[PDB]
Amino acid sequence: PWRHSGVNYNGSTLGPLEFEGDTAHQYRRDVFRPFFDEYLKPGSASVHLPDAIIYNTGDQKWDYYRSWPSVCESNCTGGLTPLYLADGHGLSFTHPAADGADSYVSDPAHPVPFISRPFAFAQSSRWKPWLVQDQREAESRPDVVTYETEVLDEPVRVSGVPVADLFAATSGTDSDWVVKLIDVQPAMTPDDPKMGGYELPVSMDIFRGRYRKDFAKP
Amino acid sequence: HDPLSVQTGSDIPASVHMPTDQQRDYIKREVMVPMRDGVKLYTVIVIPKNARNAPILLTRTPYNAKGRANRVPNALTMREVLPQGDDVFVEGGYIRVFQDIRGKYGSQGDYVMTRPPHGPLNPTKTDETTDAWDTVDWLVHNVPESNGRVGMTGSSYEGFTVVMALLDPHPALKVAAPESPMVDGWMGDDWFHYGAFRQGAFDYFVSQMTARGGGNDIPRRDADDYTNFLKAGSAGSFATQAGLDQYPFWQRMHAHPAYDAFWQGQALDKILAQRKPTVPMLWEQGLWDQEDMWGAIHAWQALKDADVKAPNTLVMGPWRHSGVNYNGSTLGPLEFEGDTAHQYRRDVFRPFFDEYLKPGSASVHLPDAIIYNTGDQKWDYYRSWPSVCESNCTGGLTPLYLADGHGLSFTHPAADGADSYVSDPAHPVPFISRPFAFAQSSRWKPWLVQDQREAESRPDVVTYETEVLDEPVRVSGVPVADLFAATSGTDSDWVVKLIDVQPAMTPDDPKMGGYELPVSMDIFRGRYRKDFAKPEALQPDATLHYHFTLPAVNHVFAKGHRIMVQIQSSWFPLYDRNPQKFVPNIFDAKPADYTVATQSIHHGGKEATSILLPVVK
Amino acid sequence: HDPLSVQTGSDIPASVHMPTDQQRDYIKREVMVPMRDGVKLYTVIVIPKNARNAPILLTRTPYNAKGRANRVPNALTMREVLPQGDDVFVEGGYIRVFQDIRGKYGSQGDYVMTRPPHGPLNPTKTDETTDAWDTVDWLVHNVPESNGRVGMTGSSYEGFTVVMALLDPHPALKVAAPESPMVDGWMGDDWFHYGAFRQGAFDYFVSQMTARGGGNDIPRRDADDYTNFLKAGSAGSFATQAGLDQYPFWQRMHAHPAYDAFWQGQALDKILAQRKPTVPMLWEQGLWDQEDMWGAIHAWQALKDADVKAPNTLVMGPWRHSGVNYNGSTLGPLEFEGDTAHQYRRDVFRPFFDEYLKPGSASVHLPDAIIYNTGDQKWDYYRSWPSVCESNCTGGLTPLYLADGHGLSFTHPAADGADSYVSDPAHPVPFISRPFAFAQSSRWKPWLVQDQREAESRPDVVTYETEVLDEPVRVSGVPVADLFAATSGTDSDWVVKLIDVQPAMTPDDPKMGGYELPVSMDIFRGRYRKDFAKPEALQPDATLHYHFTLPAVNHVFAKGHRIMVQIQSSWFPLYDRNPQKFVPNIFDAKPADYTVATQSIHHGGKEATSILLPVVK
Ligand SMILES: N[C@@H](C(=O)O)c1ccccc1
């Protein structure tokens, strides 16, 4: 649960998020070091690492996966589960039979700030944890379409690489597509009030439309 | 059984009498002062130990008079027992009186939210004026340690009472100083701002009206009030869900969405001017008064217009609402030259009050208005103010026009043009960064000085700016929004902001680099363009002319800065969203009512939008 | 007249029907549960909406039950309305019950500070044990959504009511988990620590005993309590000036400064052991518990010795007092591996309770003690704990002797020597940096983890230390202070501190460099050397043997660190100053009684001062 190069520092927190102990040190001492020791300090105890050792940002613990990922698009044990966008600005695992579309106006004269203004690239203090920043500002904008599921009854578990299956049209001849997978915190978090309703992005990325068919030939 | 070991009774004393009380430097007197109609009011008299003929400082409050005089509960010294703002009056040996208004906390009788003065709205033989009058009468005949002289003061509702008292004061009331008073709750004070509803009220309602004494807030689902109010829908939808529908005042408010007879009968600025008070007055309000921006300035001027034969000075510092009674050395990221609040309280407030409350004290001669210059960072003493205005002033206003290329210019642009922006009610512009809950006093208080860069970055907001200044522009007075806006819908809200863009870089204070600091901004509900009393639908796609006053300025746009004007059509969640479709009552707007509209602000030509700036030399 | 315009009544509604309640996911039942003596007790019952066969988690408190179940007043969710430490039980769907103890707030009857159990000290037909019995009895017969099973818990006074309940529980009480419970107020819990009085008590008295419900604090003269108490002189003199002389409990305490029959009749740890109970218990207390360090560990141990035939697990995390019901990730500058508090609640607390309250739940097999290792930074599950102690343990304690050159050695120094320091009562050592007021909760809470470097710099504090460790030293158990000290006066206090000196440099966290973190420290009142019940004057200049237990440890002194021992004779203003001259009752010490003394701590030889460390492998 670290930011870039976060492994070589402290891993207890990232932005407003809080994790279980120094996750960075944890790895350095329990996995990194012993692993290196095996091959570098002859006579050392050998380690048997799995495919992936990943921290769970939901369960708040380390997950040891013998074979990861277990689900994916091609060749994995299982397949990905499509979370469909639906009318009413919602999300459902049940493919909406009816056709539909929601629109927004992307005005380049007023581009969406990736993080609250004002930001200068020199502000490392702001650049480092920008990926866990609250996505509520964007939501309040008319140039950002947003969809959400109903307050979860039972937890939904995810592990692997999410894929954006997006069917979008632009009135222009080019366009960038930013997709953000977000975990909205509970409406109210009495133990830590500031987190109440916090729109925390677990995964997001941008895609330049001009490379839709060939990254090599725009 | 030996009582020193075995206890059968209760470890709680049956009656206390702690020596802590003899170690004090004051005396607290509690008394149910009876009003003419037989209703008694809870009154706290804080008398400095060994007080021979001391003036009384009276304050009537709906905010628990006991606690008001208990900054530090049962403090050993008066200075700690009384609020921060009483420091000069404590230093001067004044007697302090805090009274629970009729209906609240310790007092008896019925409580009526900002009880309208005796008239069409209040036919009873009692009001906030008589009660004040009676109290003063009782106070001068029941405090031997006092000198029979009474002064009145207080902020917000505690100032609203000073005004109500000024309508028909008691001979004893020698001097009054209303601070950020609740004068016109519709025009631009606490409830509405030019017809636009302030959703912060709902809480206050359930807070001050659920019970005689302390109450509670409205339980929220989400931590962000932006979400709370939007997910609810219309302002009335919230009130209903909060059960406010069962609160008498809300019912009255909801019944009168326009500036009808109900609200006009409470316009204390006009009513006070009709009575022509003869008692010396010291009107105070903050330049960034986020709660009662209309009150003081309007009352002072309305009296100035009626030619009152009495001291009538207006004081405006670099403070937020009620900021005068605390420390005024800073507000938000802004920094001023010293504790401006204490500054005024010691060098003006006190001396002025001393003149009429302490026989023999030096006499002061305050100018029309003493205002803090947020540009030069110094106190300005204006003999006549303002010098520049629309009509009846020495000189007129200087229009700063909107021009092509989203620029601002003092020269009337001949080229006719327009700039459009889509206002989607589904995504209203956050008045301050998200998330925000009305309960966040911390965030609320200085919201008026926050950076406007976030808003600027949105496509549903239009921004205009002058070039980087090469010569400073001095403004002192009330700027006017000369708006020529057009909307696709049949209704709209118009937020106009006058901003001072800080230097692109401020190496002494990096954080302020290119900071968009609003010196004056307000909202205007389009349906009231023609008449506040008679709301009327706007003609779709038609360029309509709006003309309204923005909060007063006493600022300087220094070199390196820029003047900036910002226009938008929402301000969530402070103001309820205008459905952009004309409806009989916006409080009862339905999901289908809220319509996405296209706004176009016309610049240049005959319909040239601009800010009529009070430019001075 | 038109009502929607004119109000003649009160804007305050007669009743209210807030629809917020319908949105809530729980219901609150307020019941006046009647005890066996006719006295009824206020009882807030929080029931999860649509509950069936739900266990009841009960807490009896002298701290306003209504407010206890109102973390977020009238919250829409139970998780919000209940305290942080209820999280695991709210998630489990437990019925939460908070009851006002007899004599407090909503409850009827008389209040008796920590009402002594039935016996010589309390002859009446009732007590906190019966009230609990009566309460549980009612609960299991009037809460239809409950399965009849009840678990009792609470911290501090709220944990004290749990212990009282365990003296003679109702058959429905299936499990108890006292948290940092008030067990022996004289020995080392809340009032005294080995006879030394804690001046924090005075505020507590006036605050918790002035009235049935809420009370207030004692008005101070100075903002610094170090000054406040020093100026007043003796603790009793302060109490007198504060006006505590009229409170029955204070009188009884003042009349029993020694460990006489009055306090021995309250020693719940010994009393509970005499009763041989059979209810599964899970004792908890913080390793750095600054309010009730004696309680849990002693009561738990007493039972273990009494060969109790029921689950008896002790839990000690890296928390401050009552820190178990909050977030336990940090403590002052210290940082632990994740929320240690939450960890325990989810992984141990609830599962344990689930076993006996939710039939069909898996059975947990807790060891003797689950202590958090403050050195390794991980939870330790000790099957048999401690493994080392003075009498009847697998192994004994290893002494860390005081040596010459102000060092600490594990090797018994043959050379006889002594280091002396002057203890001037007019300049007592601040238990934490000045200024400090008892009202400063933010400073009080984590005072036991503060840097001891300040003390070290004082000419009235002897500091000893090992050489920077090349091998880590693991300690797990209860360290004993084997003190051979000598004072020139006829009385004296002895403060012994066991400190872990951080590495001289900590590049990853620069502020921890050379930090002197106290893992365990306490104070002993000299006059009680021979007998806690019979105070005796000390012989001037005589090397006397003091032997008392220090707070339990489960730490590890790693490479780079040093073990440190600090000894002083005062701890102001937490502990009233010892006059250093034997007086019949230190509470009533007169100005002249206070005498400057010369303390001499002997090291090595036959009288080798040391800390009997519980060193393990
Ligand atoms: N342990 C807390 C408590 O029980 O709340 C306390 C008791 C007595 C005096 C001061 C504090």
Side-chain angles (χ1 to χ4, degrees), chain A residues 10 12 18-22 26 28-29 59 188 190-191, chain C residues 71-72 79-80 84 87 327 335-339 343 508:
Chain A
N10 201 305
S12 312
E18 285 183 349
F19 315 110
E20 296 286 277
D22 200 350
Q26 260 149 257
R28 288 210 303 273
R29 191 240 357 244
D59 257 308
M188 283 264 183
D191 299 359
Chain C
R71 193 233 299 230
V72 194
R79 176 88 175 77
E80 272 187 292
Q84 205 164 148
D87 53 342
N327 178 294
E335 283 167 31
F336 318 112
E337 298 287 275
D339 199 348
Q343 269 153 45
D508 295 358

Side-chain angles (χ1 to χ4, degrees), chain A residues 127-209:
Chain A
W127 168 253
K128 294 199 247 225
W130 94 264
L131 266 206
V132 293
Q133 284 316 327
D134 195 9
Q135 299 300 292
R136 279 202 253 216
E137 163 165 350
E139 155 164 85
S140 81
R141 290 177 72 102
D143 57 5
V144 180
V145 75
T146 292
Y147 306 77
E148 90 206 300
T149 62
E150 312 240 66
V151 180
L152 297 157
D153 242 58
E154 7 170 18
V156 179
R157 210 217 179 62
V158 286
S159 189
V161 188
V163 183
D165 214 41
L166 158 86
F167 296 91
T170 171
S171 75
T173 20
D174 207 336
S175 267
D176 280 341
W177 303 104
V178 174
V179 188
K180 304 191 240 182
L181 179 62
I182 282 144
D183 167 356
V184 202
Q185 305 309 289
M188 283 264 183
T189 43
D191 299 359
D192 193 15
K194 85 231 214 238
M195 285 326 266
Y198 190 103
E199 256 139 275
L200 170 78
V202 301
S203 175
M204 50 188 182
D205 217 341
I206 191 171
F207 189 94
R208 195 139 285 186

Side-chain angles (χ1 to χ4, degrees), chain B residues 38-237:
Chain B
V39 164
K40 293 184 242 166
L41 297 195
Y42 186 92
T43 323
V44 173
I45 321 170
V46 191
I47 312 156
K49 235 119 188 198
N50 273 320
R52 37 215 298 167
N53 286 308
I56 302 176
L57 201 84
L58 166 52
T59 298
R60 311 196 50 243
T61 181
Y63 305 128
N64 193 43
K66 199 171 152 218
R68 281 298 284 138
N70 265 306
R71 201 226 301 220
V72 183
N74 333 104
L76 284 199
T77 90
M78 185 179 196
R79 185 82 172 71
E80 355 179 39
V81 94
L82 286 189
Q84 167 155 0
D86 290 354
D87 61 322
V88 291
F89 303 113
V90 155
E91 249 139 56
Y94 280 64
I95 303 210
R96 196 55 160 122
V97 167
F98 264 97
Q99 198 193 41
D100 266 303
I101 62 161
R102 167 185 316 249
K104 280 299 263 185
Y105 287 92
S107 284
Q108 307 180 293
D110 301 322
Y111 175 59
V112 171
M113 174 55 63
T114 58
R115 213 191 170 190
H118 167 60
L121 288 182
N122 185 46
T124 72
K125 287 153 313 230
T126 25
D127 78 356
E128 282 302 320
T129 304
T130 73
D131 274 9
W133 190 96
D134 300 336
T135 286
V136 186
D137 192 58
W138 188 96
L139 276 171
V140 295
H141 294 167
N142 292 286
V143 186
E145 307 89 3
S146 98
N147 71 348
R149 311 227 140 212
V150 164
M152 269 205 118
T153 190
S155 204
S156 236
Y157 209 123
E158 309 194 339
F160 147 92
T161 44
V162 189
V163 179
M164 287 296 309
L166 274 159
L167 293 175
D168 200 349
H170 179 292
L173 195 27
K174 309 286 158 194
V175 66
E179 319 166 323
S180 274
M182 290 175 82
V183 173
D184 199 319
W186 195 98
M187 277 315 278
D189 268 340
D190 271 318
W191 320 124
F192 299 90
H193 263 230
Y194 280 135
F197 179 62
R198 296 157 68 78
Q199 291 171 136
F202 291 143
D203 266 324
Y204 184 90
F205 286 172
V206 165
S207 183
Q208 299 287 115
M209 282 176 300
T210 292
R212 169 175 341 254
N216 261 323
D217 259 7
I218 288 143
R220 301 282 213 274
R221 188 117 253 138
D222 202 87
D224 187 3
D225 257 338
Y226 180 101
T227 292
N228 283 323
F229 283 90
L230 186 97
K231 275 228 222 280
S234 89
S237 189

